[model samples]
Target: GSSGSSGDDNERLSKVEKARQLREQVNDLFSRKFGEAIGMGFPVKVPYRKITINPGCVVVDGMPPGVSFKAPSYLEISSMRRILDSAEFIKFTVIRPFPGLVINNQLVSGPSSG
Candidate 1:
């Protein structure tokens, strides 16, 4: 048995769990403070917007067995429409921050080759 792999998996899982716990703490704090602010009549709102791109499937030929990444929205980016549909492979170069998972330049800059 490879205890080393088990240890690494355990460590990664622990770290992910810790991150999730930390997020919950922050959300709880925000809820209390935000409610106080609103009750006190301090005009305030959290501002953020998510842009939806046109829906399509991304074929990751580089990944084992070829994973299909489907975009949820239908408002397409020009470069995305140009490349995503016809492409056969996608390579990774760097990891961006999201979903506590997997490596780089994936959403935009993943390539057809290394």
Candidate 2:
């Protein structure tokens, strides 16, 4: 019975749902800081390895969808300006090829910036 309908589909869906949940946990992020950012929705951070294994794309709440860009590649120009323009914190890992990229947008000021 389970074989007829591969549970992988459900698994994938669950993963996406999990990400959607985590997105809200983070409330603020900036160019190089994390402050008390006020916005409608939070960003879902995805890893480079996951993208390589399965289909990966941008999923901004207010922005247009369907843009295929690698982790490092997204920072160059295309995704950077567009995402930053939204005036919201967008989370993701790495500067492409490597790890560690996004800054927690809480407060790029005083002691809270760190």
List TM-score per model, in order: 0.27, 0.25
| Per-model lDDT | 0.29, 0.36
Badly placed stretches (over 4 Å) of model 1 are 1-12, 40-114
Global CA lDDT computed for model 2: 0.36
- Which ten contiguous residues of candidate 2 have the minimum total lDDT? 31-40
Give the alpha carbon lDDT tens digit for every residue of 1-114 in model 2. Answer: 122322446554554343343332222223122211222143333443454564333122333244433343334343444544453434333323323444435424476745
lDDT by residue (tens digit), candidate 1, 15-53: 444444444433333323333323423212211111013
For candidate 2, the per-residue lDDT at 9 reads 67
Clashing pairs in 1: 54-74, 54-75, 54-76, 55-73, 55-74, 94-104, 95-104
Query: Where does model 2 exceed 4 Å of error?
Result: 1-46, 55-66, 87-114
